[PDB]
Amino acid sequence: MKTITGVFNSFDSLTWTRSVEYVYKGPETPTWNAVLGWSLNSTTADPGDTFTLILPCVFKFITTQTSVDLTADGVSYATCDFNAGEEFTTFSSLSCTVNSVSVSYARVSGTVKLPITFNVGGTGSSVDLADSKCFTAGKNTVTFMDGDTKISTTVDFDASPVSPSGYITSSRIIPSLNKLSSLFVVPQCENGYTSGIMGFVASNGATIDCSNVNIGISKGLNDWNFPVSSESFSYTKTCTSTSITVEFQNVPAGYRPFVDAYISAENIDKYTLTYANEYTCENGNTVVDPFTLTWWGYKN
Numbered sequence: 001m002k003t004i005t006g007v008f009n010s011f012d013s014l015t016w017t018r019s020v021e022y023v024y025k026g027p028e029t030p031t032w033n034a035v036l037g038w039s040l041n042s043t044t045a046d047p048g049d050t051f052t053l054i055l056p057c058v059f060k061f062i063t064t065q066t067s068v069d070l071t072a073d074g075v076s077y078a079t080c081d082f083n084a085g086e087e088f089t090t091f092s093s094l095s096c097t098v099n100s101v102s103v104s105y106a107r108v109s110g111t112v113k114l115p116i117t118f119n120v121g122g123t124g125s126s127v128d129l130a131d132s133k134c135f136t137a138g139k140n141t142v143t144f145m146d147g148d149t150k151i152s153t154t155v156d157f158d159a160s161p162v163s164p165s166g167y168i169t170s171s172r173i174i175p176s177l178n179k180l181s182s183l184f185v186v187p188q189c190e191n192g193y194t195s196g197i198m199g200f201v202a203s204n205g206a207t208i209d210c211s212n213v214n215i216g217i218s219k220g221l222n223d224w225n226f227p228v229s230s231e232s233f234s235y236t237k238t239c240t241s242t243s244i245t246v247e248f249q250n251v252p253a254g255y256r257p258f259v260d261a262y263i264s265a266e267n268i269d270k271y272t273l274t275y276a277n278e279y280t281c282e283n284g285n286t287v288v289d290p291f292t293l294t295w296w297g298y299k300n
Contacts, residue, residue: 004044005147007051007070007078007096010037012111014142014155021298026224027118027135027157028172030298031062034116036144036151038070039109040077040098047100053080054145057134058092059119060084060175064300068094072110075101080112085119086174087181090130092116118142118157121226122172123181123260124214129230137223159223164188167277168225168258171295173268179209182273182295183260185221189281192253196279199259201243203274205266210239212262215246217255227258245276253282269297 012035016025036053061082070078080096094114121132137159143152162168168185186198202208215237216230235248239261246259265271272294280286 001046002049004049004051004098006149007040007045008036008038008053008144008146008151009149011142011144011151011153012037014153024161025156025158026160027120028059028122028224030117031115032117034114034142034144035111036114037109037111038078039107040070040105041107042105045098047098049098051096051098051146053094053096055085055092055094055114055116056143056145057090057118057120057131058085058116059131059172060086060092060117062115062117068112068114069099070096070110070112072108075103077101077108077110084175085127086176087123087125087127090119090127120224121222121228122170123183124216124218124227124230124258129227132222132226132228135223160225162225164221164225167275167289168221169273169275169293170225171263173297173299174262175299177262178264178268180263180265180268180295180297181260182263183226183258184275184277185218185225185227185256185258186277186279187287187289188256189279189284190253192255192282193248193251193257194280194282194284195286196248196251196257197276198246198248198257198279199237199244200261200273200275202263203242203272204270206271206273207241207264208239208244209262209264210241210244213237213239213244214260215258217251217257219254221256227256233257268299271295
């Protein structure tokens with residue numbers, strides 16, 4: 001019946017788990033595990049009271065469960081539902097409820113482990129652009145909040161191993177929507193671009209969701225190759241269920257044109273994009289460098 005704050009009281013560790021699928025400890029790479037400390041006082045907390053954990057800069061939880069319990073020595077003191085930020089908010093959260101228990105306690109403390117990935121960009125969306133500025137390569141402080149309480153720990157995020165000079169592509173599963181976002185950034189031109197055609201044709205069983213696209217020019221890219229800003233500029237586009245195509249003109253120096261779209265896949269773990277990738281740096285000659293990628297996912 002009341003909302004209480006300050007249940008979560010420490011950020012004990014943030015560690016990345018290396019798997020066969022994932023090779024470098026990037027912020028968006030599954031899976032990061034945040035171990036948090038929590039403490040409840042029965043004189044200030046009653047069963048049915050609620051409290052929330054805030055995770056700034058966290059895209060999603062990597063789990064198929066809808067909730068996680070705060071438990072100690074086999075007793076469930078609270079149930080916390082996952083509320084991923086995704087493309088809706090820059091932060092994810094837990095919404096928790098204090099559980100009734102068969103033990104009486106005055107004070108009890110424990111930890112919880114949260115499987116997450118961070119959002120450092122992915123599209124021209126308001127959400128991704130803001131989060132694109134969340135972290136830099138190297139040492140960072142990751143802060144979560146419960147009401148006015150701030151809890152933090154340090155972590156070291158490797159920069160992308162992919163050169164930001166060439167074309168950039170990225171895809172990311174949006175669990176609540178059963179969709180992915182997918183991004184193409186045009187290769188860099190030193191002194192802007194005369195012209196270009198950027199986008200992708202979907203195949204196998206992928207189709208483009210034309211109601212959720214972003215076309216922008218970004219002022220450079222962050223440490224993970226993602227747009228940090230998005231401004232309009234001179235282009236025409238055509239979006240159909242199988243292809244998004246953006247023809248552009250007269251982009252100035254210092255900027256990177258990009259395009260991103262939501263994708264609906266018959267199989268969210270396997271689809272194919274064919275990328276047009278044509279561009280004519282200013283004062284230069286047209287490059288026509290199409291290529292195809294198969295995107296593979298390990299969603300459960």
